[PDB]
Recover the amino acids of this structure.
C-alpha cells in the first residue's frame, strides 16, 4: 500500500484548440484497485469553451484500472515516483490533438500536469459545433515497446442524429522507474460526463477501467 | 432458418504480395451461432509462399460470430442474398494490404471469392522474413456508416523475439439487402493457426468470434 484504497486527484491543464486558449483545474477521488474515479473540472480561463468537451475528457491516469493478478500492473508499480504519458488523437476528418501528461504523487493525492493541443478541426464539424453526446465505451490494446508501454484504442463519438465520429488514440506510457512489464492485454473503458453546467465550465466526470486478457480461450 | 447450425465453407483467393502471385483454395465448416469455424487451406499456385502466412488469415466471414439476441445480427440477416466486404490492413512499417471478399450461399454452404493485394513490405521486415508467430486476440468496434456496417480493429502480430508488430484493419461490410441495423458494439476475436505443413502450403485455421456491448455498466 503505497497506492491506497482511495486516492485523491489534483490537475492543471493548459490548452489550445484551433487557436482558442484555455486553462482547466480539477479535483477528485477514486479507487485505484476498483478502477473507478470521479473528477470535478472547472474552466479557469477561456470560458465558454467553443468546442466539444468530449475531446478533453480522456486527457483528464491508468493507475485507476482494475488489474487482475496474472497481469502485471505497469502503472501502480511506478509509484510513488510516477510516470508521464503522451498521446495523439487522430480524427477521421484529419483533426489531431497532441496531449502530454506528467503524473506525480504525494501522500494520498495524485497530481497531473497536462498540456493539450488540438488543431485543424473543421470549423463546421461536430467538434467545433458541439454536436457530440458522448464517447462510446472502448477496448484499448496494451503492448510493450522499447522498454515502455503502449496503448492503442479505436474511439468513437456518438453524435446527435445517432451516427459516430471516429478517433484513433495512440499513447506511450513511460514509467519513471523500472517495473515488471506485462504481456499483451486489454483495458476496457467506459468514460462518462455525469453532470455539467450549460457552458461545461463545470463538469463531473467518471471513468471505469478494467484490464484483462481475451474472454476467448485459446485452442489447444 | 436459412443459416443452419452447421454451415460448410468453400473459398478461392487470388493474391499478390510484394509482386509474388499466388492462389489459395479452402474447404471447411463451422457453427455460425457459436461463432466457431475451421478451415483447411491449400496453396494452389505460388508455392512456397515467401512471406508470413499470418497476413492472409483474416481474409479467410462475420456470419461466424455468436450474436446475442439484443444486438441485430447484420451478417445473418443478409442471407441468402449475401454480402461483400472491403478492407484496408495498414501495418506500422507502412506496408499495406487491400482486400475484397464476395460472400454467397448455396444450401448449407458459404462460398467466398477473395481478392488480396499486399505491397510495400520492407524486405527485412518480419512479414517478408517470416518472423511472425500469430495475431493476438482482438476487439473489433462495429458501427453503422451511411446505411452499412464498418468494423475497425487494432491488430498485433506477436513476434518471434517477444515484441509486436501493429496493423490497423478498416473494413466496410455491405449487405446485399435491407437489414435491421445494430447500434455500436464490439466483436471479440481469436484467430489461430492450429497446424500447418512446413511451407504453409497446407494450413488448418480457426476463429472464435463473439459479439457484445461493453462489459462495463453505465452510470446514471
Amino acid at each position: 500500500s503505497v497506492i491506497k484504497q482511495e486516492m485523491k486527484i489534483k490537475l492543471h491543464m493548459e490548452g489550445n484548440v484551433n487557436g482558442h486558449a484555455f486553462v482547466i483545474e480539477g479535483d477528485g477521488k477514486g479507487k485505484p484497485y476498483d478502477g473507478t474515479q470521479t473528477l470535478n473540472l472547472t474552466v479557469k480561463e477561456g470560458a465558454p469553451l467553443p468546442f466539444s468537451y468530449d475531446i478533453l475528457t480522456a486527457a483528464f491516469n491508468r493507475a485507476f484500472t482494475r488489474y487482475p493478478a496474472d497481469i502485471p500492473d505497469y502503472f501502480k508499480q511506478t509509484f510513488p515516483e510516477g510516470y508521464s504519458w503522451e498521446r495523439t488523437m487522430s480524427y477521421e476528418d484529419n483533426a489531431i490533438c497532441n496531449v502530454r501528461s506528467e503524473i506525480s504523487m504525494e501522500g494520498d493525492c495524485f497530481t497531473y500536469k497536462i498540456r493539450f493541443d488540438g488543431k485543424n478541426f473543421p470549423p463546421n464539424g461536430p467538434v467545433m459545433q458541439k454536436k457530440t453526446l458522448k464517447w462510446e465505451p472502448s477496448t484499448e490494446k496494451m503492448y510493450v515497446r522499447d522498454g515502455f508501454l503502449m496503448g492503442d484504442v479505436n474511439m468513437a463519438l456518438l453524435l446527435d442524429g445517432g451516427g459516430h465520429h471516429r478517433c484513433d488514440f495512440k499513447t506511450s506510457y513511460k514509467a519513471k522507474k523500472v517495473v515488471q512489464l506485462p504481456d499483451y492485454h486489454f483495458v476496457d473503458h467506459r468514460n462518462e460526463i455525469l453532470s455539467h453546467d450549460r457552458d461545461y465550465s463545470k463538469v463531473k466526470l467518471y471513468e471505469n477501467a478494467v484490464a484483462r486478457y481475451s474472454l476467448l480461450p485459446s485452442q489447444a
User: Anything to note?
Assistant: DSSP finds one helix and twelve strands in chain B. The interface with chain A takes residues 136-139, 141, 143-145, 152-154, 156, 158, 163-164, 166, 168, 184, 186, 188-190, 192, 194, 206, 208, 210, 213-219 of chain B (CB under 8 Å).
